[PDB]
Amino acid sequence: MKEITFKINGQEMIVPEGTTILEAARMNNIDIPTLCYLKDINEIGACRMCLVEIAGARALQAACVYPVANGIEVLTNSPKVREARRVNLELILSNHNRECTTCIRSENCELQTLATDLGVSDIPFEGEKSGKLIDDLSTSVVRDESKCILCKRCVSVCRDVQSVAVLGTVGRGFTSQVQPVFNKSLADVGCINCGQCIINCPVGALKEKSDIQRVWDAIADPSKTVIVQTAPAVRAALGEEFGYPMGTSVTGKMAAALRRLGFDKVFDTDFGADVCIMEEGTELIGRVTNGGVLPMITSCSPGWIKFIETYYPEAIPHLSSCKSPQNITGALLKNHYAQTNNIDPKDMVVVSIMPCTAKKYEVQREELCTDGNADVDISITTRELARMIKEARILFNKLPDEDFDDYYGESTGAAVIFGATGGVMEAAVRTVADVLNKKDIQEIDYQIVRGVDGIKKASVEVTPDLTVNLVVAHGGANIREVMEQLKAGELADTHFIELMACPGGCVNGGGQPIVSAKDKMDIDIRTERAKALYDEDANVLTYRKSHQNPSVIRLYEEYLEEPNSPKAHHILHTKYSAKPKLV
Amino acid sequence: MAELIPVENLDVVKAIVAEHREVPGCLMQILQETQLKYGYLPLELQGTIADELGIPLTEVYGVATFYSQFTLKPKGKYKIGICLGTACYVRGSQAIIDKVNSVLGTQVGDTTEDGKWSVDATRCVGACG
Amino acid sequence: NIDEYIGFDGYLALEKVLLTMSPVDVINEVKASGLRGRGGGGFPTGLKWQFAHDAVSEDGIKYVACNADEGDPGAFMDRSVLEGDPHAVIEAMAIAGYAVGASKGYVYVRAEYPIAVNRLQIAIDQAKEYGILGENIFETDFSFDLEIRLGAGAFVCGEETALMNSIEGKRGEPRPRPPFPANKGLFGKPTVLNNVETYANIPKIILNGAEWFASVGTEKSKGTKVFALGGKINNTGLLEIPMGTTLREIIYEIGGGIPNGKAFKAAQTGGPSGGCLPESLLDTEIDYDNLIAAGSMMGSGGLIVMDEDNCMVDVARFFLDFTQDESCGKCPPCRIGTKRMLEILERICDGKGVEGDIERLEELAVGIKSSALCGLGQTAPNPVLSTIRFFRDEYEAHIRDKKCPAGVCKHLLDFKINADTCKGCGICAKKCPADAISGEKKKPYNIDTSKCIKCGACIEACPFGSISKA
Ligand SMILES: Cc1cc2nc3c(=O)[nH]c(=O)nc-3n(C[C@H](O)[C@H](O)[C@H](O)COP(=O)(O)O)c2cc1C
Ligand code: SF4
Ligand code: SF4
Ligand code: SF4
Ligand code: SF4
Ligand code: SF4
Ligand code: SF4
Ligand code: SF4
Ligand code: FES
Ligand code: FES
Ligand SMILES: [Zn+2]
Known part of the structure; x- marks a missing residue:
């Protein structure tokens, strides 16, 4: 490690080799504007915002990608720098459609914050913006080309982080635009509905498919009763919308606010989640005792199973036949609650507040229906629920707390930890150990693989006669790596591999509220969300295990008999088919 | 002049891939070589070549579009390129451009429906003397 | 023909250098020669050689590249030395590889020059036949290899970092500096980039000494410089003159003057990257410092001269x-x-x-x-x-005033007939598409400027040439 000495603006510093002047000034309490810069993701120098005077330099240099050097002098407040920033913002703003009353981003468009910050009132230079081509055809992602700034963040994210890379650049000059391949639509190619591309864009050129009109139409029907259900991870970040500090639980406030909307029933996805935990435990027991297809993987997140269908069909024996916890609880409410309440199943409308955006495509699937009836009707993301609350506009900061409904709102901590990565797998191994060997484990040690961060390996003795190999995976690149190893066959001994496309778990999902870059250089939002969720876990004083909850025991005794029954297979078990690829 | 290979014949494409796989930075070279053999390169050629390489279509399609000298649509029998160089410009080349537009009955950058005449704005061929 | 170049004291530089001259001495000689690049960057050549030589690579692998990608309109010297004598070209990089310790090089040429591409690979075969290209060059321990890369005439690729990605196979998109390509270049390894013209005089530096190259020219830039003279000129071709020759001489003493006795108005230097030099600077010394003070540069070496008739x-x-x-x-x-x-x-x-x-x-x-x-x-x-x-x-x-004195700006000029010469035959009326021309036979017609789109079909339609641009 080499030590570099540099002198800026009255202060000298020693830094390691590879240091950039930007985060060096950040550490030394100086801020420089950023558009195209992301920490360790997009470092190319296309933004052309961050100019600083360099001693001995013919012209200005961009501080974003500028490596430090020894003995240099840097001054950041010359008149040339200010004039260059003003003129360059005037140039770049002549393309972005200036009707900022109606952008979804609106208040936190980083371009708008820069525009106000530089105080550049006038725009002397006119122009002819590029062609307006609204791609309002796909299922989840909507693109608008009248806004895009060629920041290149979206393409870098979809190339590196997700290892999919269905976006590229075409043309030259004004003809240069970001497009999918073959001039098709997003849904016509192998897009995974990752949600990272829509969350990382600093302008609002991308938006999600809005179904709030359908929601208002559904709630407007007196003949239709509404069943709303909640994720464990909605209270992980929603408080950030209302100016609350990171890590606030508003669960009772959320229930009260949803009741003020006039929803007939409020409920949690937790109960069916415990049901499917019992499920995967049951076919674990079966595949152990019958030599089932191994290694086993879950079927929780729609995104990566979509990826497996699209790209690697050869692992289709390895998937779990179970349907998603969303799908489990949706079918459960549409059947058992309907039987108890003696109401026509078409007379219920079920709405879900989930953070994945891939569920928008997942609900559109033909085969996720029971008895020809829709298990769930409308799925919505956290951001658009927030805007629904804002258009209703109840002062959220003074709500009291409320409880959930019988029976399917009850909670357990091992099912609270669904929000973080591997909590599903933790609950599964804890429950199967409790069932088979009466073993009381709370946490599992994880082996961090050298050179790859985000992949986690574990192996704990479930029974003295059977030690189960455990692998955790989040991040599309990690999925690609572990799938390549699985095709190579070196994971033959492995038993469970848990996968989601979105890195860091659902707290880092596509439906989570938008955050800027500044807080990302400060604090990992994943870390604070995980701490808040784990603190919520430690406070669950009713049950830390799913199989001990009296509600799931009641349902199993009365209506579900045992898992892997013919009724259980017919209602909760499904098959998947490979999808045609257009790549 | 060797006959252009029909674009539906894909064994030649993968033969080219196999013989020039080992070469570093082979994308541009293979692209221009298939341009030479096939005459024009439709979209399924990017699809097939990227499937053989196993690397996504985005960069291949981009470098196909980023080089203006690479063609995606069928052209005419004869291409007419008029020198838009400065030495040709100062002589008054716009008069020649308008005369070509008048006689050809076709605008700049379009191929005649007969598939015989095409016009291009080559900036220089180098014979500025 | 390989026998022709060896008969003109060719390939003797490697014979001397590989046996007598150390790699460090070569950089000293070019630094003593005061050589600075004509590619447009204005960087001293020998200074560049220091940064590549002292830099340390991980695997002990270094690279060199030859830039033959000319794109300047009216500039053709880059191919001309290649199609004139590639034997002198390939000899240059052999000295370059010895000075840096690079065992392999790359040469970049446009594919639309079939005579240039065919000629160079024949010289590649002739050199490797005699043993010049390959291993144990002239019974020494030095081994050097070359590979042809076919560019496609992308003008933006002519940048230093831009061509590196084209060789790497990605998009020809430029990279910010620092890091310089001399430190992190092709495959992240130290690289040397030099154009063909500066490679050309390298054997003469070794053979005839740096003082000979220094003995002609001024202090800041020594030797001679070549341009592809063009534009409104009676005679077209190439000229090899030292810097400091005044602009008046090349137009008149060498160029022979403006064709057809027209009036000189402005002159273009450096092509699209340069500027216009009018009659107020016919006495300007042409070298590095004066022309940049006048707001232009050599570019790739393009010279275009304009006359009175051009707006x-x-x-x-x-x-x-x-x-x-x-x-x-x-x-x-x-x-x-x-x-x-x-x-x-x-x-x-x-x-x-x-x-x-x-x-x-x-x-x-x-x-x-x-x-x-x-x-x-x-x-x-x-x-x-x-x-x-x-x-x-x-x-x-x-x-x-809304006029073009040169009569070029089509939407601002007007058309007037010469009534003293116009027969009034009315052919221009037949050839007026917007129906602006009216009149009677044997009498000059009358024209409505506000009617026609100023297309100009009438002026050539006159058999007597009486229509004048107004
Ligand atoms: C856009 C662009 C195009 C260029 N084209 C050429 C060219 O065609 N021929 C050439 O010799 N140099 C060109 N250069 C300059 C080269 O970058 C490089 O400076 C030259 O090879 C080295 O000579 P130097 O020592 O003067 O830099 C170009 C530079 C830029 C930025
Ligand atoms: S970029 Fe979009 S959100 Fe930001 S100010 Fe412009 S229109 Fe509004
Ligand atoms: S969506 Fe537009 S502005 Fe955002 S990163 Fe992509 S190209 Fe740039
Ligand atoms: S949803 Fe995923 S695959 Fe589709 S463009 Fe966004 S990041 Fe890429
Ligand atoms: S992290 Fe959450 S949103 Fe992302 S794929 Fe997994 S379950 Fe879906
Ligand atoms: S970096 Fe700027 S100057 Fe260079 S090619 Fe791109 S747009 Fe043109
Ligand atoms: S310039 Fe054209 S339109 Fe105008 S009078 Fe002459 S021929 Fe007619
Ligand atoms: S200008 Fe020429 S064509 Fe027109 S009437 Fe006169 S002589 Fe005839
Ligand atoms: S913000 Fe510095 S180059 Fe992008
Ligand atoms: S000047 Fe004639 S082709 Fe360039
Ligand atoms: Zn004019």
């Missing part, structure tokens, strides 16, 4: 049309500013502009000059800034 408004548009076409397109200046440059000008050509737009031009021109990443866009307004500095009053004719 400088249109040529300013014409050079600007180049920059908009060849933009790579990352930075907002070279992407958006070019049409911002453009959109003002044709309204001036069509008379749709208003007053004060000339000041608006200079406001953004200085801004993008200081804020362009790619080297092309930073030199984009230099032709425009050259015109406004000395030919400001021509625009006042167009913006205010």
Whole structure:
């Protein structure tokens, strides 16, 4: 490690080799504007915002990608720098459609914050913006080309982080635009509905498919009763919308606010989640005792199973036949609650507040229906629920707390930890150990693989006669790596591999509220969300295990008999088919 | 002049891939070589070549579009390129451009429906003397 | 023919250097020669050799590259030495590889030069037949290898970092500096980039000494420089003259004067990256420091001369049309500013502009000059800034008076017939598409300027040439 000495603006510093002047000034309490810069993701120098005077330099240099050097002098407040920033913002703003009353981003468009910050009132230079081509055809992602700034963040994210890379650049000059391949639509190619591309864009050129009109139409029907259900991870970040500090639980406030909307029933996805935990435990027991297809993987997140269908069909024996916890609880409410309440199943409308955006495509699937009836009707993301609350506009900061409904709102901590990565797998191994060997484990040690961060390996003795190999995976690149190893066959001994496309778990999902870059250089939002969720876990004083909850025991005794029954297979078990690829 | 290979014949494409796989930075070279053999390169050629390489279509399609000298649509029998160089410009080349537009009955950058005449704005061929 | 070059004291530089001269001594000789690159960057050549030599690579692998990708209109010297004598070309990089310790090099040529590409590979075969290319070069321990890379004439690829990615197979998109390609270049390894013309005099430096190269020329730049002379000139070709020759001599003593006795008005240097040199600077010493003080540079070495008959408004548009076409397109200046440059000008050509737009031009021109990443866009307004500095009053004719004195701006000129010569045959009336020409036979006709679109079909339709541009 080499030590570099540099002198800026009255202060000298020693830094390691590879240091950039930007985060060096950040550490030394100086801020420089950023558009195209992301920490360790997009470092190319296309933004052309961050100019600083360099001693001995013919012209200005961009501080974003500028490596430090020894003995240099840097001054950041010359008149040339200010004039260059003003003129360059005037140039770049002549393309972005200036009707900022109606952008979804609106208040936190980083371009708008820069525009106000530089105080550049006038725009002397006119122009002819590029062609307006609204791609309002796909299922989840909507693109608008009248806004895009060629920041290149979206393409870098979809190339590196997700290892999919269905976006590229075409043309030259004004003809240069970001497009999918073959001039098709997003849904016509192998897009995974990752949600990272829509969350990382600093302008609002991308938006999600809005179904709030359908929601208002559904709630407007007196003949239709509404069943709303909640994720464990909605209270992980929603408080950030209302100016609350990171890590606030508003669960009772959320229930009260949803009741003020006039929803007939409020409920949690937790109960069916415990049901499917019992499920995967049951076919674990079966595949152990019958030599089932191994290694086993879950079927929780729609995104990566979509990826497996699209790209690697050869692992289709390895998937779990179970349907998603969303799908489990949706079918459960549409059947058992309907039987108890003696109401026509078409007379219920079920709405879900989930953070994945891939569920928008997942609900559109033909085969996720029971008895020809829709298990769930409308799925919505956290951001658009927030805007629904804002258009209703109840002062959220003074709500009291409320409880959930019988029976399917009850909670357990091992099912609270669904929000973080591997909590599903933790609950599964804890429950199967409790069932088979009466073993009381709370946490599992994880082996961090050298050179790859985000992949986690574990192996704990479930029974003295059977030690189960455990692998955790989040991040599309990690999925690609572990799938390549699985095709190579070196994971033959492995038993469970848990996968989601979105890195860091659902707290880092596509439906989570938008955050800027500044807080990302400060604090990992994943870390604070995980701490808040784990603190919520430690406070669950009713049950830390799913199989001990009296509600799931009641349902199993009365209506579900045992898992892997013919009724259980017919209602909760499904098959998947490979999808045609257009790549 | 060797006959252009029909674009539906894909064994030649993968033969080219196999013989020039080992070469570093082979994308541009293979692209221009298939341009030479096939005459024009439709979209399924990017699809097939990227499937053989196993690397996504985005960069291949981009470098196909980023080089203006690479063609995606069928052209005419004869291409007419008029020198838009400065030495040709100062002589008054716009008069020649308008005369070509008048006689050809076709605008700049379009191929005649007969598939015989095409016009291009080559900036220089180098014979500025 | 390999026997021809060896009969003209060829390939003797490697014979001397591989046996007597150390790699460090070669850098000393070129530094003692005062050689500085003519590629446009204005960097001293021998100084570049230091940075590659002392830098340390992980695997002990270094690379060299040869830049033959000329794209300047009217500039053809780069191929000419290649198609004239590639044996001298390939000899140069052999000395370069010894000085740096690079065992393999790459040569980049456009594919639209079939005579150039075919000639070089024959020389590659002849060299490797005699043993020059390959291993144990001239019974020494030095082994050097070359590979041909076929470029496709992308002008933006002529940048230092830009061509590196083209060899790497990715998009020809420029990279910010630092790091310099001498430190982190091809495959992240130290690399040396030099154009063919500066490679040409390298054997003469070793064979005839640095003082001989120093014995001609001025102190800041020594030797001679070649240009592809062109434009409004009676005689076209190439000239090999030392720097400091005044601009008046090359037009008159060497060029023979303006063709047809026209009046010289302005001269283009450095192609689309340069500017206009009028009659006020016919006595300017042509070298590095004077021309950059006059707002231009050598570029690739293009010289175009203009006469009285050319309206400088249109040529300013014409050079600007180049920059908009060849933009790579990352930075907002070279992407958006070019049409911002453009959109003002044709309204001036069509008379749709208003007053004060000339000041608006200079406001953004200085801004993008200081804020362009790619080297092309930073030199984009230099032709425009050259015109406004000395030919400001021509625009006042167009913006205010709405006339083109050169009769070039089509939407601003008018047509008048010569009534004393016009027979009044009415053929122009038959050839007027907008029905602007009226009159009677044997009498000169009358024309409504407001009717015709000023297409100009009438002026050539006159058998006596009586229609004049007004
Ligand atoms: C856009 C662009 C195009 C260029 N084209 C050429 C060219 O065609 N021929 C050439 O010799 N140099 C060109 N250069 C300059 C080269 O970058 C490089 O400077 C030259 O090879 C080295 O000579 P130097 O020592 O003067 O830099 C170009 C630079 C830029 C930015
Ligand atoms: S970029 Fe979009 S959100 Fe930001 S100010 Fe412009 S229109 Fe509004
Ligand atoms: S969506 Fe538009 S502005 Fe955002 S990163 Fe992609 S190209 Fe840039
Ligand atoms: S949803 Fe995923 S695959 Fe589709 S563009 Fe966004 S990041 Fe890429
Ligand atoms: S992290 Fe959450 S949103 Fe992302 S794929 Fe997994 S379950 Fe879906
Ligand atoms: S000047 Fe700017 S826009 Fe033009 S090629 Fe260079 S970086 Fe790209
Ligand atoms: S310029 Fe054309 S339209 Fe006008 S009078 Fe002459 S022939 Fe007719
Ligand atoms: S200008 Fe020429 S064509 Fe027209 S009437 Fe006179 S002589 Fe005839
Ligand atoms: S913000 Fe510095 S180059 Fe992008
Ligand atoms: S000047 Fe004639 S082709 Fe360039
Ligand atoms: Zn004019």
